[PDB]
Amino acid sequence: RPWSEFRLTPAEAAAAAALAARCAQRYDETDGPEFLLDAPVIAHELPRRLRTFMARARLDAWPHALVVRGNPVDDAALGSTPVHWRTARTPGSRPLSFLLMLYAGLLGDVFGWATQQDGRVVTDVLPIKGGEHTLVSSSSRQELGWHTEDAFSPYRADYVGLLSLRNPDGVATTLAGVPLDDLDERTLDVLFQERFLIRPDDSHLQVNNSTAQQGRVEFEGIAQAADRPEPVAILTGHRAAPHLRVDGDFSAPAEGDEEAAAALGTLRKLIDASLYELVLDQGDVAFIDNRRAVHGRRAFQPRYDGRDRWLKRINITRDLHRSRKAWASRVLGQR
Amino acid sequence: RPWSEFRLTPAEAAAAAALAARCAQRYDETDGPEFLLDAPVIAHELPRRLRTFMARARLDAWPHALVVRGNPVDDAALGSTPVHWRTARTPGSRPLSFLLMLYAGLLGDVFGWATQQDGRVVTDVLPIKGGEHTLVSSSSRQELGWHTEDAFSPYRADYVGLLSLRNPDGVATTLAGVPLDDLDERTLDVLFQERFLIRPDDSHLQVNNSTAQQGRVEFEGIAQAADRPEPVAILTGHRAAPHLRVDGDFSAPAEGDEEAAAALGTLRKLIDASLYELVLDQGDVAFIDNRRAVHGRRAFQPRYDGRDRWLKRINITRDLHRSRKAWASRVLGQR
Ligand SMILES: NC(=[NH2+])NCCC[C@H](N)C(=O)O
Ligand SMILES: NC(=[NH2+])NCCC[C@H](N)C(=O)O
Ligand SMILES: [Fe+2]
Ligand SMILES: [Fe+2]
């Protein structure tokens, strides 16, 4: 498989769950300053075989994601799937939010965005009625097209963490790496040049945040990136193992640059044809390598009956200080 | 103080020492592939108050270094200071090398350079007879001028770790941060521009490595950086908290750029005047923030009697994959 996989034993999974439940008893909130600081050290108490997997697999050269299977979830304890992210911090989902945060702390520094879901660090992926055909993660009937998370931003996550609270119909997450087996050298050369434009996705729009949040100055920086994007490369790093920065629904060539456009159009077709599926069943956790892979989610028919697919999500950076200019409480944004 | 300081209790220090001694009993070498992979997880067993300090202090906005005082060292067990780094992996220093590696694993991914001390990850700082007036860390009578470690390279460490095995005369390490209180806006503007040159320091020269190592192809890349340096900036990141890349003895303006030269000359004088001292006594460990601070070492008169000042040293990155293009066994270099 193109990702690295780990399966908890039932005893390991129970121990991790018990640690998260203890955290939920001892801290008021996952995003509070106290748990943000303490979670990386508390995670040292997770099952050792899991800590070994996370410490080693992050350093491997090849995986598109790190996948951990087998966390127990009881639908009766979890409760119904919220109708909106605003009300999605339910008591039934609270221990599992702490659990995701603990796993994330083994990989890096967690953070959020002032412009996304009210600046929350642990965010929610669930279908919002009336928002089926949008470009944000609360879509359903329209596929979420492949993209680098927050491609517009130099401060985008290194890893995107996902914990599947429920997914009864097995809706697939989509992934693709760099199609290096099919990129000719000239096309590769062009993709490494600063000849492309990449704008903020719709999740950072004020209409996708609560009222009283539309006044955050960080939305100004989002407007600047959408109205005046600066040219950037799509590929960076080692030509034999490039890092990837692209959004299928927001990337464009520089104005009038037809050679850049040809390279991007070629890349689109290669990624479309190599896109593959990862199904996060209930209790599965994935950390997607946001430099090696683009990701999306298949179209699906929402239920709106209380048992819709529901993920918790978290952004992770290897170095919080890389985003110093955007520090707005572990919440990023710029004027 | 401009750095963040932690002092082990005697019991904490004994526990950390016992963990390192166990590591030395169970692994053949500090730089072996096995201990390189295992050390970050073994470090989870270090005293919890120290793990809390390392997890929190790395995320603070201000410190130039993280300093840990109080590791016991017995000069009789340690043995005499080696006459050269080649023979400096003595049994008496072996547990303390494991200890430095364990501490380092709390901060990031350790690595070495094919061109420096035979590609070792744990390296040695000690005075080499006849090499008193050099630009490398085995100098003595000539001050080691302030510099960003491996300023020439985009793959330079985020943190430089130092463990003082002995320092009987209290010779000071030197540090300085960005002199932001005195840089006018125009000078700051220029330092943020790609108008400077920075060449590899003498530690990467073949004459400062063993024979049979002069044939490594990685020395080719060092020659390229010294013969054909590309223009770079000295400051990057947030204008209110810039990251720093400069070498007092190897930085230069771009050819004929007199405004760049004025900015660099101004920066030199401000750093000279703000340089301060940190004395690593026997058993003290420091992790210098190589993005916030330049560092050096005061001139001193070497002894050459077996009790000279002696440090173990290690390079740390927050993200090993940033250097993928230079991956040569956790040892970096390029053709
Ligand atoms: N091509 C796209 N749809 N890009 C935007 C992706 C959606 C965004 N990451 C979200 O969480 O809502
Ligand atoms: N200005 C300088 N002396 N630069 C080079 C510093 C010495 C180098 N870091 C070493 O370990 O030997
Ligand atoms: Fe995404
Ligand atoms: Fe140094």
Residue numbers in the entry:
A (entry chain A), B (entry chain A): 22 to 349, 352 to 358
Quote the passages of the study that discuss this structure, keeping the authors' original sentences.
We selected the 2OG-dependent hydroxylase VioC as a model enzyme for active site reengineering. VioC catalyzes a regio- and stereoselective hydroxylation of its amino acid substrate, l-arginine, to form 3(S)-hydroxy-l-arginine, a vital step in the biosynthesis of the nonribosomal peptide tuberactinomycin antibiotic, viomycin. The catalytic iron is coordinated by His168, Asp170, and His316, with His316 trans to the site at which oxygen is proposed to bind. The catalytic FeII center is coordinated by a conserved His···Glu/Asp···His facial binding triad.14−17 In the case of halogenases and engineered azidation/nitration biocatalysts, the carboxylate is replaced by a noncoordinating residue (typically Ala/Gly), which leaves a vacant coordination site for anion binding. Reaction of the ferrous enzyme with molecular oxygen and 2OG generates the highly oxidizing ferryl (FeIV=O) intermediate, which effects selective H atom abstractions (HA) from bound substrates.
To probe the effect of axial ligand electron donation, we replaced His316 by a noncanonical Nδ-methyl-histidine (MeHis) ligand using an engineered pyrrolysyl-tRNA synthetase/pyrrolysyl-tRNA pair (PylRS_MeHis/tRNAPyl), which selectively encodes MeHis in response to the amber (UAG) stop codon. Stoichiometric replacement of histidine by MeHis was confirmed by mass spectrometry. A 1.6 Å X-ray crystal structure of VioC MeHis316 superimposes well with a published wildtype structure (secondary structure superposed RMSD of 0.2 Å),47 with no significant changes in the location of the iron cofactor or the imidazole planes of the axial His/MeHis ligands. Introduction of the additional methyl substituent on the axial ligand displaces an ordered water, which, in wildtype VioC, forms hydrogen bonding interactions with the Nδ-H of His316, the Asn311 side chain, and the backbone carbonyl of Ala314. The substrate l-arginine (occupancy 0.8) and succinate (occupancy 0.8) adopt similar conformations to those observed in the wildtype structure, with the l-Arg pro-3S hydrogen apparently well-positioned for selective removal by the ferryl complex. The wildtype enzyme achieved ∼600 turnovers under these conditions, a value in line with previous reports. Remarkably, despite mutation of the primary iron coordination sphere, VioC MeHis316 was able to perform >400 turnovers, with no observed change in regioselectivity. Product retention times in biotransformations with VioC MeHis316 are indistinguishable from those observed with the wildtype enzyme, suggesting that the high degree of site selectivity achieved by wildtype VioC is retained upon axial ligand substitution, as anticipated, given the similar l-arginine conformations observed in the wildtype and VioC MeHis316 crystal structures. Replacing His316 and its coordinating water with an axial MeHis ligand has little effect on ferryl structure, Fe–N bond length, electronic configuration, and spin state ordering.
